[PDB]
Amino acid sequence: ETLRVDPTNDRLSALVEIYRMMRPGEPPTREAAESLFENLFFSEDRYDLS
Amino acid sequence: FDAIKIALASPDMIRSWSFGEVKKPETINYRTFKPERDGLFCARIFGPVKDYECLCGKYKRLKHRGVICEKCGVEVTQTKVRRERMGHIELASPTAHIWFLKSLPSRIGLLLDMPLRDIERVLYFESYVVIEGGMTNLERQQILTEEQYLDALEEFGDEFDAKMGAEAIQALLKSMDLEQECEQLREELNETNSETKRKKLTKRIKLLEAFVQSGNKPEWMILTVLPVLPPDLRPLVPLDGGRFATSDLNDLYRRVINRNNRLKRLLDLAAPDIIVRNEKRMLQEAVDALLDNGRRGRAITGSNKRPLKSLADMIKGKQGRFRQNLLGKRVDYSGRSVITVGPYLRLHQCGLPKKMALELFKPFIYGKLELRGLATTIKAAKKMVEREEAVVWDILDEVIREHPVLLNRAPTLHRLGIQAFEPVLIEGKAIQLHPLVCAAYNADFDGDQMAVHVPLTLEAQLEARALMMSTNNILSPANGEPIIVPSQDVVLGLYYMTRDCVNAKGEGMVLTGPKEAERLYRSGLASLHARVKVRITEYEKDANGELVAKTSLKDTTVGRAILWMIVPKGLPYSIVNQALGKKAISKMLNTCYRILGLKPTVIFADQIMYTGFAYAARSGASVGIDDMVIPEKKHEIISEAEAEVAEIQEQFQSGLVTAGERYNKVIDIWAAANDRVSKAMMDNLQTETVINRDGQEEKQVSFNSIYMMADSGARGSAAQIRQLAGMRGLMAKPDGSIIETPITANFREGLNVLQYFISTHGARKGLADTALKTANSGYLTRRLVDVAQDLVVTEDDCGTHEGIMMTPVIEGGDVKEPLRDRVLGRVTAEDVLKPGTADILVPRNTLLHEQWCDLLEENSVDAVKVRSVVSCDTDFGVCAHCYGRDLARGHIINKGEAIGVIAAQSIGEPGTQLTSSIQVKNKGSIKLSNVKSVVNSSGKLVITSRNTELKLIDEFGRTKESYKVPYGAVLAKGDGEQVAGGETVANWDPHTMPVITEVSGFVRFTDMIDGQTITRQTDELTGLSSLVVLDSAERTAGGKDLRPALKIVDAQGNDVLIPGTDMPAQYFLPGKAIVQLEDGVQISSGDTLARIPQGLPRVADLFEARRPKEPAILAEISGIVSFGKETKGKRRLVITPVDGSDPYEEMIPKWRQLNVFEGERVERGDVISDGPEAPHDILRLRGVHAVTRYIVNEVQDVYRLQGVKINDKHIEVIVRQMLRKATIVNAGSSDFLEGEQVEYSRVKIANRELEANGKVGATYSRDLLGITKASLATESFISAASFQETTRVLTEAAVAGKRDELRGLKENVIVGRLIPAGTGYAYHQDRMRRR
Amino acid sequence: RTTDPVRMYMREMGTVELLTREGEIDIAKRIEDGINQVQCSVAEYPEAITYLLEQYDRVEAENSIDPELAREKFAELRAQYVVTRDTIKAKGRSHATAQEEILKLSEVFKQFRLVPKQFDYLVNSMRVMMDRVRTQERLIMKLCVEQCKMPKKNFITLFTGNETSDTWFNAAIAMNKPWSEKLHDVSEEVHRALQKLQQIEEETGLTIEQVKDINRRMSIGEAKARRAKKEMVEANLRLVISIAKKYTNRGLQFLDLIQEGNIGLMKAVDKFEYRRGYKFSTYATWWIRQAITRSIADQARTIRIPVHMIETINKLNRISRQMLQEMGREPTPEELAERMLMPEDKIRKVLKIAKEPISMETPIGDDEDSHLGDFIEDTTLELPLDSATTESLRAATHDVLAGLTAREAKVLRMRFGIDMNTDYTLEEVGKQFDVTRERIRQIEAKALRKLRHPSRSEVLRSFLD
Ligand SMILES: [Mg+2]
Ligand SMILES: [Zn+2]
Ligand SMILES: [Zn+2]
């Protein structure tokens, strides 16, 4: 039921589908959306549990 | 001035307002504390800094009053010009007013039929709009992108004209139309026939007719020039720490003028379109953050990382200008101080510190020192005050007498949380409060910071002395019972005074009266407890105020006679001879106020407090460990409870029941053990083995130290004593359940660390309840005080000739309150009479006081006609003889008494303390209503109707017992039979609602196919089954095409009818219709076929009346109610009357319990869905006299369930103000489908349909709005702009031109004049007549 | 589709495409073409000769070139003008060799010595001449299209012909024209405007069509220069958003610094002068940093401290941070004063004016119930003294000086301003009564000797406190 309503399927569009939910109004590129996903989920400078 | 007129700001109006324009972002100089030329604080634009002192120091000291200094433009005048000088920032580009852009509703799209997404597309510089085009493709109000703008540029060229941003929508609003669009929308509103379009086009055309009628323009809605706030109101003042004290609004105005200067530098420098469009977008965002910071985007920060205050954050909630600086304001002559006990004072007398009265009464001290000649000047008297001369204490004692002062608890709970007092001079630094009125404060001595406010002038001084002194009101405004009753300590002393003994060491001595009683108590030879005979002189005014003298011997005690020494002449001894509890002393004070009046009652209360203090000093009422006795059979009850829970655990282990039944059984046996130990401690507490005069053993009321606080109700009910001495009953789990292991031990034995944890669970839950829901009740008081802000007694009596039929609640159980205290103080509408149709003894317009309530109590009255405020015909208030009696005075209510804020303080009073086998309990005759009954073949009477309500009327003629019976019951008794209590008279299964048929005939299965519509399934329980049907969710579309129905007719092929009507005998087949009868058998009338199965947030939801969790819809018109389209889950509902609205349909969401079947007979306004009822349909079908009666029977019983009685008028005038705005149904006077107030609807009936001509169209329909909704629908705007959503309702007032006449009571509070209520009502009688 | 203006500003930045090095020098060459189009089109203007003549008169009293080249190279266009003026005006205006001499005058113009104040004057004079001929055409359109019942299409075909003499006026009174027969009712403005057009044409010495296409070339070159400036500033918004990271303090928002760097880059466009061979980012960095420091000096502070004191207090903050890093202790003003080579009182004076004043909505208490503003003392104080004595002393003087039964009270009430508007000296009260000053002084001393005794003015004596 998640896969019946998915907005985008591709990895790029998908990642972007996020950029619009996080930082709306700015149309991103591939590398910009990838860097935003990395520094928002999988970066030690913005995420630490220790 | 006498009226407040609001409109939209024109740029020429701002240019006239300006008297100086600002163009530079400088505020002041940084070295010298002087603003230079043309700045945000400048002297040319706004005015000078000091009083008559120019900028450079050239013209000062009153020499140049109106000239302008040519060096810097300063006008040498006072500092008062700095609070009224305006702005006029020269904006290079027009900008968007965010109050008219991002509001809810936005009011710029509803003027244009444009969605807010497209408004965000055009105002943010992303998309273009075209005002007019040469072709029909580029029509008006079209939303074009930049690529579409380029395509229209290469396609059209100079034919079209499409700009972007605030200037484009400004020209669009300016050059659309003025009245032709209004006429076209007016004709196209009623040209089309729809409902979704006629709920927004009527609001658009009402907005447009307000624009044309108020003289406003849509060009003035948008902002082309921004005026700044006056600089004294945003003061950049040097604080005493070295740094400066600025406002954040100064920073926002500096940023707005900086972006304006950047725009002005961008226009002449030939900027490209991207930078100037971003500059206009940033100017729009800056003025948006200046007006309302939390609408257009992220809140703008400062240096301290905080959201800065905008012009909307300056007026919003409790932190706004209204509720912090305008409505609730700090005041001079207000002394914060704690409360102490003055027991040696009168009821109108309080204490006052000599230091606080010395500093607080300083103008009175200086005036009395100058008028007596003891002081020469003001500062010599000030030095006499600062050095504490001996004579200033004497002059303070002279000025403090005959000078009342207002004591005030912060925050107040009700109206009696602040009243005046005549202070005396004592030492100390605190206020000695009189102990009798601390219950009216509900302010126990916990160090409560009481403010003491000084009335200055003789108007306010006599208003303090004669109206709001504590000697003026012995009753409460919430109920007729006195809340200034003797409180806990003095009622304990009085209960120790009125107590009797069996030993009674002053036995045998006959007392001459009160004199000898107090003599032999004070001499020590006789005790306070002696059942002897006392000759007491008593008086009663049986004639017109004439007291009669009589003296006889009564079986009483000595202390009752010593209290009778303090009791005045007019009281009887029937109230003094009992045990004299707190409710008995409340009844004593009530009867004293009814008989003697206010003149002896205050002196009686003062003498009662003095005697209670003097005989609680000599009482020695001291709680101890041996006084709080343990019951002797306490350990065996806990041992039997342990054996019972061991039996329950063994029945849970060896499988017979589940864990939920185990929890229910352990809760039941622990409640039984709690009741057993409560009766054990009650039997050990209320009985005490005392010796008689001879050698005997006789029990009596005990002299225990806690039974005086338990039986009399001094401080604590029976549950507190039952949990203190006996074990604790039940606690509160955080999920809402009850702990299965209650506290076995009590407080004297000690609580274990586990048991203290189970206790503190429910204790911290109740404390969080007291922390949250009492503040929620305070905001509910804030809500309810702003919907009844115009109810003042204007006239004395209007010719309405209509009222309510009042009845007490006997809902479910027995009776709770009588009719005497229910219609206490109310005024009758018609000439009510006895239950027999004779001897009319009550006039048309009279109150219900003494010689009227007992005159009905001696009769067997059950329902009387009472005049209300919901039927009062006059506007902007009600009449005196239509409301009844003012509850704190006890006579005819004066013209000016504001009833609505009385009701708000009354409903806000208990907000801090809120936190089947039908067996009759009396004897009477069986009576029903809407009767459809028949005798079956067993000797009983079944019910084949839904709206039957079983009520019991005895031989006297009163409705002592009543019930609510659903459809499908069997009565064991007949109509008019004298029954006895205890026995069950209504027998029906509570788990199912049957389909009992009154057709006595054969059984025929018709119009059903086994397999498509119905199925074949035999019941394996009893073996009695037939062709039955399952639920509607499992069947196929055979029931969706052919309607399944049971036509109970004869077996010979012919058809029968219903006895009484002409409808053929055909019952319908809903879901879960598993019938238990075969065909061909002769069933009788009354046989069963099938089995079909079935608080303060609640107070706030019932006051708002918005929608419950499950709405209970009702039937509209009496007739045949059937189904429309068949059940696709939630399909439809249709209503077909015989002489009513035939094609009108309805909608049923949940098909759980249908009261009436699809095709049977209903009554208009009959219940359809079960559950909580939404009052919108109840007002839409039943009148106001039914909805108001339902509310004063529901929420008053809810308040009574907590243990506090409120008069029903206070939960009646708020309901009257809840339907203030009504919905008109026909055009001709104001509009077709507008929401108009009841005053504007009453002024239209009295103008057209009274003396001018016939009916031009004035019928309407009332609507109960929400409390948050009715506060935004007031005809006055300045009181509506103070409750909540001041942005929204202030924009609605600005775009409509709502000129306030200041008719309501808070509307003169906000403007700062005399209110049109109370003493100011007679001033407004001359104000509104001379205008 | 969003709510933040800076994110859609980034969207508008991402709509346009950036530049490489060859794209940078191509946009610089487009800027050069947009400048040189106006530079060669102004050579055909007759007022440029008088502009260069007044420039030669300005430099007569005067890397850089020698002034002898400025004296020599600013006088040949005068010779070309005085050998063209007998052909462009005299002996007919429509002539081929006259246009050849016009092109000869235009091809000797490249002696620029460009000054930004000099460039504005010719553009302003030609723009107000274009505005004059445009409002001339606008008033002609107002008298001919709206009036006399003829549309706009019946105007341009006779307007483009000559627009010099009276033939176009009676050309609009053509073969029948019954709706346009009102000759003298419309002549009164149009021949008065035609005489103004004729004196404009004799001022410029050229027909109106040639200066019309010259001004059209001015508009075309200005539009091309504006589009080149637009793509130059749009390709370098990454420069301002990458330089705005080092000044992201809590004094201003991001967008104000971005749009100040925008006008700094717009100034750097005309201050670039790309013929040296540098990049636009390197030279634009200094101008955008100057605009950023100007915005952080003028704005970001309630009390507007100027840019030089902002620079000295920024240097003082940097020196204080350096002494914090070198010492660890708090920086005393003595070490900052000796390292700043300034006196210590100036250091404490610029330290006093440290930062923005505490706003009015800071939670100085424990909760959000009482913000600031409920603690400020009143500057316009109204004490019991200042409210009571300021009227009771007035009543006391009105009671005591009423006992003065002669003109001494009447000349003393205006001596200080009691119950009067303007305070007067002895001379102004003299001209009303007693023009010799010492008479008023002696009666004032007599009233002083009457009032200073503690016998009846003791109520006036008690007011000294
Ligand atoms: Mg308290
Ligand atoms: Zn000045
Ligand atoms: Zn009335």
Side-chain angles (χ1 to χ4, degrees), chain B residues 797-798 800 872-874 878-879 882:
Chain B
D797 195 15
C798 78
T800 171
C872 190
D873 201 70
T874 181
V878 293
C879 294
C882 296

Side-chain angles (χ1 to χ4, degrees), chain C residues 172-233 235-302 304-349:
Chain C
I173 321 295
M175 64 301 295
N176 48 317
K177 287 246 180 178
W179 43 85
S180 281
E181 214 61 42
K182 297 177 296 298
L183 195 73
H184 284 347
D185 221 336
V186 78
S187 305
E188 189 281 331
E189 43 179 350
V190 72
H191 74 81
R192 192 168 51 188
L194 194 49
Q195 291 302 316
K196 183 177 61 61
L197 190 60
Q198 279 183 2
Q199 74 98 4
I200 279 174
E201 284 170 1
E202 82 193 68
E203 272 172 348
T204 188
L206 196 47
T207 174
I208 204 64
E209 298 301 281
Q210 288 197 217
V211 62
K212 258 162 196 165
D213 60 68
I214 277 179
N215 290 135
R216 280 176 183 270
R217 286 301 158 88
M218 298 306 176
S219 159
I220 283 298
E222 196 75 25
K224 195 158 189 173
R226 184 173 293 184
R227 293 311 176 273
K229 280 181 182 60
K230 180 253 289 181
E231 61 200 356
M232 178 85 85
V233 297
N236 294 127
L237 300 178
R238 298 161 187 86
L239 265 300
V240 287
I241 72 183
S242 45
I243 204 174
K245 322 181 307 299
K246 323 177 193 64
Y247 301 93
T248 321
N249 62 329
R250 305 302 178 272
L252 279 173
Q253 314 154 61
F254 203 76
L255 299 101
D256 293 326
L257 316 178
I258 288 302
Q259 271 212 316
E260 204 77 22
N262 285 339
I263 81 176
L265 201 152
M266 192 184 306
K267 289 181 177 300
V269 161
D270 55 282
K271 291 294 288 184
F272 190 27
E273 187 40 73
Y274 77 103
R275 299 185 184 273
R276 301 280 298 272
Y278 295 111
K279 296 178 182 178
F280 197 40
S281 75
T282 306
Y283 189 72
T285 303
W286 305 106
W287 272 95
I288 293 157
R289 190 180 285 107
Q290 169 256 346
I292 280 178
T293 50
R294 180 188 175 93
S295 46
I296 209 167
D298 296 359
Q299 330 179 0
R301 298 280 304 276
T302 72
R304 182 182 172 272
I305 171 167
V307 64
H308 49 91
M309 216 60 60
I310 274 292
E311 182 66 36
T312 60
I313 201 56
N314 276 127
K315 288 178 60 61
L316 192 146
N317 285 18
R318 190 175 72 255
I319 285 300
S320 78
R321 285 174 185 177
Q322 187 199 14
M323 295 299 107
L324 274 154
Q325 292 297 299
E326 284 279 344
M327 180 173 297
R329 220 184 57 189
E330 283 164 291
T332 65
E334 273 73 28
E335 46 184 346
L336 311 184
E338 63 85 29
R339 202 159 301 270
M340 209 49 192
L341 50 91
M342 294 298 299
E344 318 186 4
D345 58 333
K346 314 295 180 57
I347 299 303
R348 302 185 193 94
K349 174 189 178 182

Side-chain angles (χ1 to χ4, degrees), chain B residues 339 409-411 442-449:
Chain B
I339 42 174
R409 202 268 308 271
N442 191 8
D444 53 354
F445 296 96
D446 295 350
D448 288 332
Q449 302 95 12

